[PDB]
């Protein structure tokens, strides 16, 4: 990480967290950080525990992708930029061959 301290702290923190998927919380008052995880022992829950109000929503069209490119700064390029990209055959077959490219830096 390199931080320009002239950026406002909120925005620097946000970009820093975004770099590794972390998020922070102050429920229970202590400042806490919780990375995303695959957990072996999730908390079990059943519908009947709830108040019974339930809503499911799915937003495939914008959010879904099947190929990607990412850009970085690389010392093997003298700290010029490098551009990784790849496809997924299985995902492109599950989609009806429609190509859709995710952009990242």
């Amino acid at each position: 990480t390199i931080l320009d301290t002239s950026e406002s702290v909120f925005k620097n923190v946000q970009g820093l967290l975004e770099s590794y998927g972390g998020a922070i919380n102050n429920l229970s008052g202590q400042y806490r950080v919780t990375v995303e995880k695959y957990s072996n022992t999730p908390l079990e829950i059943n519908f009947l525990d709830t108040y019974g109000d339930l809503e499911l929503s799915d937003t495939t069209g914008r959010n879904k992708f099947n190929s990607v490119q990412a850009s970085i700064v690389d010392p093997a390029l003298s700290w010029k930029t490098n551009s990784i990209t790849f496809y997924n055959s299985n995902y492109k077959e599950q989609d009806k061959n429609l190509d859709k490219k995710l952009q990242l830096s």
Partner: protein
């Protein structure tokens, strides 16, 4: 500062309440769960509400009422109220000789009656602590000789200091007039006032 009544003014019998309504207010938030449980959470005080209605009034007793109510409004004090249905003297003795230990809290009181008191309370009696205006109601009572215990509703609003004394007799509610901001009396050509009623809410 009693609300005038036939016991204070037997000559003005019209002041006898035609009928009285006592309401518990126990504000609570509640929900029903799809598994058929009920869950509820309590915050804020219980309070007693009272409604009073009067018949037609003649001008003299009416003037006595207004002379009271305006004195209350000017002074900003409290209205004391008696409630005749509970006027029974089933417990008596040197109440001020009883010892209540300090640090009792929550809904159970235990007392050393020192063998002094005679008679017993009953469920539904009123009960009051000498140093606080609250009125409680007896749910249940027990003896172990001189030791007594009573379980009381609502829950206690104070921790006992050890200076408190019980009060079984002559309990007066202390209240103020939530209706009072738009008060007023119709006068009919009979020469008699009509339509008076009072809504009271205890206040501490």
């Amino acid at each position: 500062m009693r609300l005038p009544d036939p016991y204070t003014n037997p000559e003005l019998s019209g002041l006898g309440f035609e009928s009285v309504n006592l309401i518990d207010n126990d504000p609570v938030i509640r929900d029903e769960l799809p598994n058929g449980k009920v869950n509820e959470v309590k915050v804020s005080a219980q309070y007693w509400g009272i409604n009073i209605s009067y018949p037609e009034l003649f001008p003299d007793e009416y003037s006595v009422l207004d002379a009271f109510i305006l004195e209350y409004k000017r002074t900003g004090g409290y209205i004391d109220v008696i409630l005749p249905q509970y006027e029974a003297f089933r417990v008596r003795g040197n109440t001020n000789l009883v010892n209540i230990p300090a640090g009792q809290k929550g809904s159970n009181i235990t007392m050393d009656t020192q063998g002094v008191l005679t008679g017993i309370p009953k469920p539904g009696d009123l009960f009051k602590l000498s140093n606080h205006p609250k009125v409680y109601k007896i749910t249940s009572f027990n003896r172990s000789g001189n030791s007594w215990s009573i379980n009381v509703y609502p829950d206690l609003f104070i921790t006992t200091t050890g200076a408190e004394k019980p009060v079984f007799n002559g309990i007066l509610f202390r209240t103020k007039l939530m209706n009072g901001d738009a008060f007023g009396s119709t006068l009919n050509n009979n020469g008699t006032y009509s339509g008076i009623s009072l809504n009271l809410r205890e206040s501490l």
